[PDB]
Amino acid sequence: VDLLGRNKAADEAAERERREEEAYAAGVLDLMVDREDLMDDEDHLLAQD
Amino acid sequence: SVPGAPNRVSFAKLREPLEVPGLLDVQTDSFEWLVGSDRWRQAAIDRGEENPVGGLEEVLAELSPIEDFSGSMSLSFSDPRFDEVKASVDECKDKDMTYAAPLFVTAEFINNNTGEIKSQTVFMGDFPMMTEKGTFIINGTERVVVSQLVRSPGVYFDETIDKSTEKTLHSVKVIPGRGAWLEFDVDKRDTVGVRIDRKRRQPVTVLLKALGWTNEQIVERFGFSEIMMGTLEKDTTSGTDEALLDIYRKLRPGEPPTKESAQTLLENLFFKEKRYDLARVGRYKVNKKLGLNAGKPITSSTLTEEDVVATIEYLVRLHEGQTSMTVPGGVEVPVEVDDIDHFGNRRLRTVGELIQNQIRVGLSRMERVVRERMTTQDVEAITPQTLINIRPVVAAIKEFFGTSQLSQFMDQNNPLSGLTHKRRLSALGPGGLSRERAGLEVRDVHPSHYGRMCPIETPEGPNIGLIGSLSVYARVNPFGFIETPYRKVENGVVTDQIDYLTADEEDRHVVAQANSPTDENGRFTEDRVMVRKKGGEVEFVSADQVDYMDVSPRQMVSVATAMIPFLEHDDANRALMGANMQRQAVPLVRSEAPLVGTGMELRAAIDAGDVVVADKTGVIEEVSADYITVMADDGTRQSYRLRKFARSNHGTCANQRPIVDAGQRVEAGQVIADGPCTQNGEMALGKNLLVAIMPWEGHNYEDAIILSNRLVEEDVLTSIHIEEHEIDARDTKLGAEEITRDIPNVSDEVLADLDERGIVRIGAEVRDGDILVGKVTPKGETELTPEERLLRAIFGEKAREVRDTSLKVPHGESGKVIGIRVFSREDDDELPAGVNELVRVYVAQKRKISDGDKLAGRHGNKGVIGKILPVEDMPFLPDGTPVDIILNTHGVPRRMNIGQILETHLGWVAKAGWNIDVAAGVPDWASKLPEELYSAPADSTVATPVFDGAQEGELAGLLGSTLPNRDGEVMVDADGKSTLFDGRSGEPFPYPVTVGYMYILKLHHLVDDKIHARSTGPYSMITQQPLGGKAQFGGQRFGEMECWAMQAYGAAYTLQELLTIKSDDTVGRVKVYEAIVKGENIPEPGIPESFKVLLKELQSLCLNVEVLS
Ligand SMILES: [Mg+2]
């Protein structure tokens, strides 16, 4: 069995989970404050950068 | 030092061996090289170069000669010559021209079949030049090209560890920068694979055989490393020809495999200068790394036969573990792994090379059609003009100066901002890194910044680390490697043999500190000296091991950072904040040099170019508020125009005033006029104010600042702000809109300040909503409603065909009109297509300090002005002097910026002269003070150079030797504290408080530009939501987090009313407005557009979405 191993044949579902997670994060980053209207003392770096 | 040089006693103890070089040399030398100026030629040949070639000449030689496919004709270019500039800087800036000069090149055409020769001068066009300040005048704007930071092409060696089954793999990738890829990598199978063109792993022996190697020679020479023996064993190729055929088959199997084409492709791939080049810096890097063909100059732009074998041999040595290597025909070199962050690998693309790249692209685009015109025309009827089109090159150079990221508007906020901007090292742009990439890997401070890139001063925005500044002592190597000077040390004695070394050149030596004590002769007085090793680590070594020494303590800081006194006492973060804040100081109406500063105030002022310096010795003929006339010793008159009340790019007023009088002798280089933020030639960004460190009734709570009303009354912190309003009149499909004094449907009182032609008179005062220039547009269809028809019948005012569109003063702005500029097609002005007239009006205002304006020092201490007390309220010294500013005590120790307290103490010591009791003998603390610094009068200015400033003990001793005041008493005791009376109650404060003089500056973050408000205004065209991004009627963003907060509060009704009524609910919004104005209660909100639009869209996708109860 160890010699045979596994090939992960066409793990499309894993890619779907990857896309779902990536699709989630883009929303998380978009949730946070953008530089369009900042109201901090000085223009600091943001996680989007 | 310099002719003027106002007396400023310094606290320095060390001696400066090398004067600070021209701060603006980076921006000027590159361009001098590009245009091949005579002085550049003299400097290059004197350095040890023979027949040096300029950038333009280099590009022309690379392009020329060009031969047609038939091979019967040839075209060549040579001898580029420049002409006088079309106009002056001032004229170009006034008329929105471009400061450029005609460029000419000698073109020659040769007919091979016959022998006809045609030589002529072709007009290349207007080459944008630059002024003496390293700026380009593009369309009447001062743009700056910031040097870019890129990875120098060459051969690099790396080693990684496999994360699957341990063990390590070494690889070498060759980056040419203008051609394909060629790398050799080691796998975990005891082999050495070569992946040509990053396609697929191949045996190295295959490449060796292809070049013309055989098994016998391989087994005779590469007999050191066993891995390559295994690779040769695995190799199946027998002869050299098969290797070429095998490589050709593996590369492109589709095409037929033939020996001739197989060799030709590989020959074409890397061994041709027309497809694969190293840009003449990769060759130098490979020569320095491998060590081949050392000594003799090299012009080849390809890989030498020995280079590939040497690289492979070096790779196997590195895997083997040999720390040294040498090959016949070269010099022995060490073996190690290279990193991408190291400046022996990161070069600098200055303005000259940046322009050269675009010129090369333009010339290639031109040549593409030059050869076509050769192949399409008839012979014996062709001249250089008939096959040379200058349109593409001009278009390319124009596009680079108006769209390229590297070229951007020069920060004209103050002289220091411009000076720092010019000498900036950006790590992004075309061919650089993205703003959303390289996190905490390329923006970290590498141990190689020391002496070549300031490690403390850098923007805190998105570009942290990516953008930095060049150090004080640094000049770019002709190749493009930043090199720094060092003092030669031999046999433990420091000598005057300054040598400029690069990072890699420095990694082979041991450099010591500049403050290390030395004997009078020059020998080292101590035994163990602190030095830097080859790995960027600090270690104590023997005095004999010292190889080099730093030129001065402030060899790592930049110009901006060197202006911060007591920088060694401030934390790194606070120092960064202060350095970046010093570039945001608005020029004040009356500037004043700091009482306490460094030695960089003078130079930074002169090099910034914001002052006028006499060109040659002479006598001031006359002085006026507009110009200065000086008569030189040779009888040649010189006249300097003084740009007066000139608007800077950022809105600050930029003006100069003379500081000389008639009959005054002036030497060359002496400052005769001073700029916006300069006094007597020294930079004066801020003001010296009397500061008391103490909390005050909570008005300075949380970094807030309390100010005295005196600053307002005496214009201590007042500034001039100028804004430009522009409007055009153009032709329209309904007719040409005209500017006119007459305006419809408006009273005659509002336009009482308009002139004959409908423009506001100069000198008039304007507030928001005032008409600056009348303007009307054709309207068209009227179709008046019956209400309007009756209303205008009773009044009798007939319909007007035109609609009012006059320019209005934006809300919140006021001032006086100081200038008007008018352009028109009637007078042949170069207006854009369809535009008939253009009007610009300048409004200037006198902005005083007010609550909420940011205010900060040089040590990162920042705060808004929370209150401005009257004079009588502020705490006052026993002699009756009221303190000008109060800074909260709680904020100093936490922020870890104790340097501001030292600045305060030394400023007090400088304001009131000091006198050490040296009559009986120098005290112990004063034994280190220079002879000149034992006694000084009142209002003296002292210098405390960074890392070589006044020691804490010396300052403490000086505090106890201050002179008395007019009454004859000392206000501040030996501890730096003084008693203060309460201005409100009159009782003296229970304990003494720190009082002194601090240098503080007004930042551009004013309240007037940071106040917004909306009730009802413009709405978006598509989303129907209020639009933003502008300070007139921009709306605020209500994010999802605020929605979560509202939901947590349980505030259902507020969330609904805020998401629908106040945004994209057209039906209910007008009803809400009507209810508010009528006094009726607000109706219940409807359904937002964001839902009806969603419903219609989702229905459009053949989805039967329906609602039900
Ligand atoms: Mg804050």
d(CA B393, CA B359) in angstroms, rounded, equals 7
Contact A43 B460 (CB under 8 A): yes
Instruction: Identify the CA nearest to B409 among candidates B137, B155, B199.
Output: B137
Q: Check CB contact of A33 with chain B, cutoff 8 Å.
A: yes
Q: Which residue, among B895, B1037, B1038, would best test binding to A if mutated, counting the most A CBs under 10 Å from its CB? A: B1037
Burial track B770-799 (b if 16+ CB lie within 10 A, e otherwise)? bbbbbbbbeeeeeeeeeeeeeeeeeeeeee
Q: Which residues contact B313 (CB under 8 A, 6 or more apart)?
A: B222, B325, B327
In this structure, what DSSP letter does residue B1075 have? H
| Burial label, B946 (beta-carbon count in 10 A; 0-12, 13-18, 19+) | buried
Q: Check CB contact of A36 with chain B, cutoff 8 Å.
A: yes
Contact B1029 A31 (CB under 8 A): no
Q: Check CB contact of B1036 with chain A, cutoff 8 Å.
A: yes
- Chain A hits for B460, CB-CB cut-off 8 Å, are 42-45
Contact yes or no for B190/B286 (Cβ under 8 A): no
Q: Check CB contact of A45 with chain B, cutoff 8 Å.
A: yes
Which of B460, B1034, B1040 shows the shortest C-beta gap to A42? Answer: B460
Contact yes or no for B585/B685 (Cβ under 8 A): yes
Is the link from the previous residue into B176 a cis peptide, with omega within 30 of 0? no
Which of B462, B1028, B1040 shows the shortest C-beta gap to A49? Answer: B462
3-class DSSP assignment, residue B60: helix
Work out whether the CA dihedral B763, B764, B768, B769 comes out positive or negative.
negative
Describe chain A by its helix, strand, coil percentages, rounded to 5: 40, 0, 60
- Chain A hits for B705, CB-CB cut-off 8 Å, are none
Contact yes or no for B909/B944 (Cβ under 8 A): no
d(CA B425, CA B408) in angstroms, rounded, equals 14
Instruction: Identify the CA nearest to B858 among candidates B905, B912, B901.
Output: B901
- Find residue B120's DSSP bridge partners: B107
- Chain A hits for B462, CB-CB cut-off 8 Å, are 45-46, 49
d(CA B501, CA B486) in angstroms, rounded, equals 7
- What ranges make up the beta strands (E) of B551-626? 596-597, 612-613, 618-623
Instruction: Give resolution in angstroms.
Output: 3.5
Work out whether the CA dihedral B452, B456, B458, B461 comes out positive or negative.
positive
In this structure, what DSSP letter does residue B529 have? E
Contact yes or no for B471/B558 (Cβ under 8 A): yes
HSE-CB for B74 with a 13 A CA cutoff: 13
The one-letter amino acid at B162: D
Instruction: Tell me the Ramachandran region of residue B248: left when phi exceeds 0, alpha when psi lies from -120 to 50, beta otherwise.
Output: alpha
Q: Check CB contact of A3 with chain B, cutoff 8 Å.
A: no
Contact yes or no for B360/B279 (Cβ under 8 A): no
d(CA B1043, CA B1014) in angstroms, rounded, equals 20
- Chain B hits for A42, CB-CB cut-off 8 Å, are 460
**Number of Cβ pairs < 8 A linking chain A and chain B:** 26
Contact yes or no for B507/B334 (Cβ under 8 A): no
Instruction: Identify the CA nearest to B492 among candidates B445, B540, B538, B527.
Output: B527
Contact yes or no for B1034/B890 (Cβ under 8 A): no
d(CA B695, CA B372) in angstroms, rounded, equals 80
Displacement of CA B870 from its chain's centroid (Å): 42
Instruction: Identify the CA nearest to B333 among candidates B353, B346, B352, B314.
Output: B314
Query: Which residue precedes each gap in chain A (C to N above 2.5 Å)?
Result: none
Contact yes or no for B838/B728 (Cβ under 8 A): yes
Q: Calculate how far, in angstroms, residue A43's C-alpha sits from the geometric centre of ligand 1.
A: 11
Which of B436, B1037, B1040 shows the shortest C-beta gap to A49? Answer: B436
The one-letter amino acid at B871: V
Instruction: Identify the CA nearest to B585 among candidates B498, B648, B532.
Output: B648
Contact yes or no for B648/B602 (Cβ under 8 A): no
Instruction: Identify the CA nearest to B549 among candidates B482, B497, B598.
Output: B497
- Strand pairing category for B942-943 and B9-10: parallel
3-class DSSP assignment, residue B802: strand
Please name the residue that has the structure tokens 């300097």: B640
- Chain A hits for B461, CB-CB cut-off 8 Å, are 43-45
Q: What angle do CA B706, B711, B713 make, to 5 degrees?
A: 130
Which of B436, B461, B1041 shows the shortest C-beta gap to A44? Answer: B461
d(CA B702, CA B710) in angstroms, rounded, equals 24
d(CA B421, CA B441) in angstroms, rounded, equals 25
Contact A31 B460 (CB under 8 A): no
- Chain A hits for B1040, CB-CB cut-off 8 Å, are 31
d(CA B341, CA B324) in angstroms, rounded, equals 23
Q: Which residues contact A26 (CB under 8 A, 6 or more apart)?
A: none
3-class DSSP assignment, residue B481: coil
Contact A37 B1041 (CB under 8 A): no
- What ranges make up the beta strands (E) of B848-965? 854-856, 862-869, 885-887, 914-915, 935-936, 942-943
